[PDB]
PDB file of C-alpha atoms in Angstrom:
ATOM      1  CA  UNK A   1     -86.484  46.996 302.020  1.00 12.79           C
ATOM      2  CA  UNK A   2     -86.572  50.783 301.531  1.00 12.79           C
ATOM      3  CA  UNK A   3     -85.936  50.431 297.783  1.00 10.24           C
ATOM      4  CA  UNK A   4     -88.652  47.678 297.538  1.00 11.08           C
ATOM      5  CA  UNK A   5     -91.058  50.001 299.435  1.00  9.48           C
ATOM      6  CA  UNK A   6     -90.669  52.642 296.646  1.00 10.60           C
ATOM      7  CA  UNK A   7     -89.234  50.697 293.666  1.00 10.43           C
ATOM      8  CA  UNK A   8     -92.011  51.696 291.228  1.00 10.75           C
ATOM      9  CA  UNK A   9     -90.237  54.900 290.091  1.00  8.10           C
ATOM     10  CA  UNK A  10     -87.021  53.009 289.015  1.00  9.93           C
ATOM     11  CA  UNK A  11     -89.130  50.173 287.498  1.00 10.85           C
ATOM     12  CA  UNK A  12     -90.901  52.875 285.409  1.00  8.06           C
ATOM     13  CA  UNK A  13     -87.394  54.242 284.504  1.00  9.09           C
ATOM     14  CA  UNK A  14     -86.360  50.758 283.225  1.00  8.26           C
ATOM     15  CA  UNK A  15     -89.502  50.674 280.951  1.00  6.61           C
ATOM     16  CA  UNK A  16     -88.840  54.262 279.723  1.00  4.88           C
ATOM     17  CA  UNK A  17     -85.208  53.337 278.749  1.00  4.60           C
ATOM     18  CA  UNK A  18     -86.476  50.123 277.060  1.00  6.28           C
ATOM     19  CA  UNK A  19     -88.925  52.187 274.916  1.00  2.00           C
ATOM     20  CA  UNK A  20     -86.120  54.432 273.629  1.00  3.95           C
ATOM     21  CA  UNK A  21     -84.024  51.307 272.898  1.00  2.00           C
ATOM     22  CA  UNK A  22     -86.984  49.724 270.951  1.00  2.00           C
ATOM     23  CA  UNK A  23     -87.393  53.020 268.992  1.00  2.65           C
ATOM     24  CA  UNK A  24     -83.672  52.794 268.002  1.00  3.40           C
ATOM     25  CA  UNK A  25     -84.166  49.109 266.907  1.00  2.00           C
ATOM     26  CA  UNK A  26     -87.238  50.056 264.807  1.00  3.28           C
ATOM     27  CA  UNK A  27     -85.257  52.960 263.235  1.00  4.66           C
ATOM     28  CA  UNK A  28     -82.283  50.630 262.358  1.00  4.14           C
ATOM     29  CA  UNK A  29     -84.615  48.024 260.697  1.00  7.71           C
ATOM     30  CA  UNK A  30     -86.339  50.617 258.427  1.00  8.62           C
ATOM     31  CA  UNK A  31     -83.052  52.409 257.496  1.00  8.42           C
ATOM     32  CA  UNK A  32     -81.345  49.117 256.395  1.00  5.87           C
ATOM     33  CA  UNK A  33     -84.486  47.954 254.470  1.00  6.33           C
ATOM     34  CA  UNK A  34     -84.375  51.306 252.567  1.00  5.52           C
ATOM     35  CA  UNK A  35     -80.635  50.906 251.718  1.00  4.74           C
ATOM     36  CA  UNK A  36     -81.204  47.305 250.414  1.00  6.37           C
ATOM     37  CA  UNK A  37     -81.902  47.173 246.619  1.00  6.04           C
ATOM     38  CA  UNK A  38     -84.299  44.753 244.816  1.00  4.51           C
ATOM     39  CA  UNK A  39     -81.641  43.758 242.178  1.00  4.30           C
ATOM     40  CA  UNK A  40     -77.813  43.964 242.496  1.00  2.18           C
ATOM     41  CA  UNK A  41     -74.725  42.974 240.389  1.00  2.40           C
ATOM     42  CA  UNK A  42     -72.195  40.561 242.086  1.00  2.04           C
ATOM     43  CA  UNK A  43     -68.902  42.274 243.111  1.00  2.00           C
ATOM     44  CA  UNK A  44     -65.868  40.860 241.174  1.00  2.00           C
ATOM     45  CA  UNK A  45     -62.050  41.433 241.610  1.00  2.00           C
ATOM     46  CA  UNK A  46     -61.432  44.441 239.303  1.00  2.00           C
ATOM     47  CA  UNK A  47     -65.017  45.852 239.651  1.00  2.00           C
ATOM     48  CA  UNK A  48     -65.446  49.243 237.892  1.00  2.00           C
TER      49      UNK A  48
ATOM     50  CA  UNK B   1     -99.861  34.620 294.916  1.00  2.00           C
ATOM     51  CA  UNK B   2    -102.019  34.489 291.755  1.00  2.00           C
ATOM     52  CA  UNK B   3    -104.603  32.498 293.819  1.00  2.00           C
ATOM     53  CA  UNK B   4    -104.156  35.204 296.552  1.00  2.00           C
ATOM     54  CA  UNK B   5    -103.077  32.546 299.095  1.00  2.00           C
ATOM     55  CA  UNK B   6    -101.810  34.015 302.409  1.00  2.00           C
ATOM     56  CA  UNK B   7    -102.764  37.581 301.347  1.00  2.00           C
ATOM     57  CA  UNK B   8    -103.767  39.874 304.269  1.00  2.00           C
ATOM     58  CA  UNK B   9    -106.176  42.764 303.330  1.00  2.00           C
ATOM     59  CA  UNK B  10    -105.198  46.081 304.981  1.00  2.00           C
ATOM     60  CA  UNK B  11    -107.919  46.753 307.602  1.00  2.00           C
ATOM     61  CA  UNK B  12    -107.516  50.554 307.290  1.00  2.00           C
ATOM     62  CA  UNK B  13    -108.607  51.082 303.634  1.00  2.00           C
ATOM     63  CA  UNK B  14    -110.125  49.239 300.616  1.00  2.00           C
ATOM     64  CA  UNK B  15    -109.609  49.615 296.813  1.00  2.00           C
ATOM     65  CA  UNK B  16    -112.290  48.871 294.187  1.00  2.00           C
ATOM     66  CA  UNK B  17    -111.831  47.848 290.486  1.00  2.00           C
ATOM     67  CA  UNK B  18    -108.151  49.083 290.426  1.00  2.00           C
ATOM     68  CA  UNK B  19    -104.653  47.428 290.226  1.00  2.00           C
ATOM     69  CA  UNK B  20    -101.738  48.825 292.331  1.00  2.00           C
ATOM     70  CA  UNK B  21     -98.488  47.570 293.973  1.00  2.00           C
ATOM     71  CA  UNK B  22     -98.867  47.419 297.801  1.00  2.00           C
ATOM     72  CA  UNK B  23     -96.067  46.867 300.406  1.00  2.00           C
ATOM     73  CA  UNK B  24     -97.203  44.491 303.189  1.00  2.00           C
ATOM     74  CA  UNK B  25     -96.099  41.411 305.160  1.00  2.00           C
ATOM     75  CA  UNK B  26     -96.783  38.486 302.747  1.00  2.00           C
ATOM     76  CA  UNK B  27     -95.659  34.815 302.254  1.00  2.00           C
ATOM     77  CA  UNK B  28     -93.068  34.101 299.497  1.00  2.00           C
ATOM     78  CA  UNK B  29     -94.443  32.917 296.088  1.00  2.00           C
ATOM     79  CA  UNK B  30     -94.142  29.094 295.690  1.00  2.00           C
ATOM     80  CA  UNK B  31     -93.241  28.664 299.383  1.00  2.00           C
ATOM     81  CA  UNK B  32     -94.023  25.103 300.676  1.00  2.00           C
ATOM     82  CA  UNK B  33     -93.599  26.403 304.254  1.00  2.00           C
ATOM     83  CA  UNK B  34     -93.666  24.160 307.376  1.00  2.00           C
ATOM     84  CA  UNK B  35     -96.427  21.473 307.441  1.00  2.00           C
ATOM     85  CA  UNK B  36     -97.776  20.190 310.784  1.00  2.00           C
ATOM     86  CA  UNK B  37    -100.551  17.539 310.736  1.00  2.00           C
ATOM     87  CA  UNK B  38    -102.599  16.541 313.845  1.00  2.00           C
ATOM     88  CA  UNK B  39    -103.047  12.744 314.368  1.00  2.00           C
ATOM     89  CA  UNK B  40    -105.221  10.429 316.489  1.00  2.00           C
ATOM     90  CA  UNK B  41    -103.657   8.896 319.698  1.00  2.00           C
ATOM     91  CA  UNK B  42    -103.083   5.113 320.122  1.00  2.00           C
ATOM     92  CA  UNK B  43    -106.235   3.066 320.895  1.00  2.00           C
ATOM     93  CA  UNK B  44    -107.015  -0.694 321.065  1.00  2.00           C
ATOM     94  CA  UNK B  45    -110.527  -1.602 319.768  1.00  2.00           C
ATOM     95  CA  UNK B  46    -113.328   0.065 321.835  1.00  2.00           C
ATOM     96  CA  UNK B  47    -110.960   1.231 324.648  1.00  2.00           C
ATOM     97  CA  UNK B  48    -108.724   4.250 323.843  1.00  2.00           C
TER      98      UNK B  48
ATOM     99  CA  UNK C   1     -92.337  37.627 321.032  1.00  2.00           C
ATOM    100  CA  UNK C   2     -89.184  36.170 319.343  1.00  2.00           C
ATOM    101  CA  UNK C   3     -90.038  32.420 319.457  1.00  2.00           C
ATOM    102  CA  UNK C   4     -93.143  30.209 318.941  1.00  2.00           C
ATOM    103  CA  UNK C   5     -93.662  26.433 319.488  1.00  2.00           C
ATOM    104  CA  UNK C   6     -96.539  24.421 317.873  1.00  2.00           C
ATOM    105  CA  UNK C   7     -98.663  22.539 320.500  1.00  2.00           C
ATOM    106  CA  UNK C   8     -99.320  18.830 319.634  1.00  2.00           C
ATOM    107  CA  UNK C   9    -103.014  17.725 319.397  1.00  2.00           C
ATOM    108  CA  UNK C  10    -103.946  14.117 320.276  1.00  2.00           C
ATOM    109  CA  UNK C  11    -107.446  12.453 319.845  1.00  2.00           C
ATOM    110  CA  UNK C  12    -108.221   9.080 321.534  1.00  2.00           C
ATOM    111  CA  UNK C  13    -110.273   7.941 318.467  1.00  2.00           C
ATOM    112  CA  UNK C  14    -111.292   4.237 318.217  1.00  2.00           C
ATOM    113  CA  UNK C  15    -109.470   2.306 315.413  1.00  2.00           C
ATOM    114  CA  UNK C  16    -112.834   2.071 313.502  1.00  2.00           C
ATOM    115  CA  UNK C  17    -113.624   5.774 314.264  1.00  2.00           C
ATOM    116  CA  UNK C  18    -110.111   7.105 313.515  1.00  2.00           C
ATOM    117  CA  UNK C  19    -110.436  10.218 311.249  1.00  2.00           C
ATOM    118  CA  UNK C  20    -107.741  11.941 309.139  1.00  2.00           C
ATOM    119  CA  UNK C  21    -107.112  15.564 310.222  1.00  2.00           C
ATOM    120  CA  UNK C  22    -106.398  18.445 307.792  1.00  2.00           C
ATOM    121  CA  UNK C  23    -102.686  19.424 307.724  1.00  2.00           C
ATOM    122  CA  UNK C  24    -101.968  23.114 308.597  1.00  2.00           C
ATOM    123  CA  UNK C  25     -99.147  24.904 306.703  1.00  2.00           C
ATOM    124  CA  UNK C  26     -97.227  27.740 308.417  1.00  2.00           C
ATOM    125  CA  UNK C  27     -95.652  30.382 306.110  1.00  2.00           C
ATOM    126  CA  UNK C  28     -93.354  33.099 307.543  1.00  2.00           C
ATOM    127  CA  UNK C  29     -94.242  36.775 306.808  1.00  2.00           C
ATOM    128  CA  UNK C  30     -91.658  39.212 305.400  1.00  2.00           C
ATOM    129  CA  UNK C  31     -92.252  42.762 303.975  1.00  2.00           C
ATOM    130  CA  UNK C  32     -92.882  42.189 300.247  1.00  2.00           C
ATOM    131  CA  UNK C  33     -94.164  44.494 297.450  1.00  2.00           C
ATOM    132  CA  UNK C  34     -97.257  42.752 295.995  1.00  2.00           C
ATOM    133  CA  UNK C  35     -99.077  43.532 292.712  1.00  2.00           C
ATOM    134  CA  UNK C  36    -102.774  43.476 293.732  1.00  2.00           C
ATOM    135  CA  UNK C  37    -105.920  43.168 291.562  1.00  2.00           C
ATOM    136  CA  UNK C  38    -109.191  44.591 293.076  1.00  2.00           C
ATOM    137  CA  UNK C  39    -112.659  43.591 291.792  1.00  2.00           C
ATOM    138  CA  UNK C  40    -115.903  45.647 292.079  1.00  2.00           C
ATOM    139  CA  UNK C  41    -116.342  43.848 295.450  1.00  2.00           C
ATOM    140  CA  UNK C  42    -112.769  45.054 296.208  1.00  2.00           C
ATOM    141  CA  UNK C  43    -111.539  41.650 297.484  1.00  2.00           C
ATOM    142  CA  UNK C  44    -108.158  40.468 295.966  1.00  2.00           C
ATOM    143  CA  UNK C  45    -108.518  37.398 293.695  1.00  2.00           C
ATOM    144  CA  UNK C  46    -105.260  37.878 291.649  1.00  2.00           C
ATOM    145  CA  UNK C  47    -101.755  39.027 292.769  1.00  2.00           C
ATOM    146  CA  UNK C  48     -98.000  38.807 291.840  1.00  2.00           C
TER     147      UNK C  48
END
């Protein structure tokens, strides 16, 4: 009952943590898209 | 709760054109509750 | 007051003049945080 009476501060904390987590997800997507190449050569046993 | 059924306005103060979370005694959302229906007593024709 | 009892209501209506009576629903009140929407009038039309 006491926590429900003032639960807004922790609810805001949950949103703030979620925003940082979303920022990490957006960063991972862009980084991997950059590493991916338009054309590639298939890897074969004895490559190089 | 969306239809504001069972909501009690605080008599002490009012809020205009704003949205806030307020702690108060309120009925549970989707609560059927206890239903009591008044009924007529037995009567035969004209004489009750 | 720790206990309440509903009082039965009986009407000696004639069979022809018998009338259905609106059911009344009783919902218990417990302290609950409620999201409240206030209009320009300030009455609550929407809540969570």
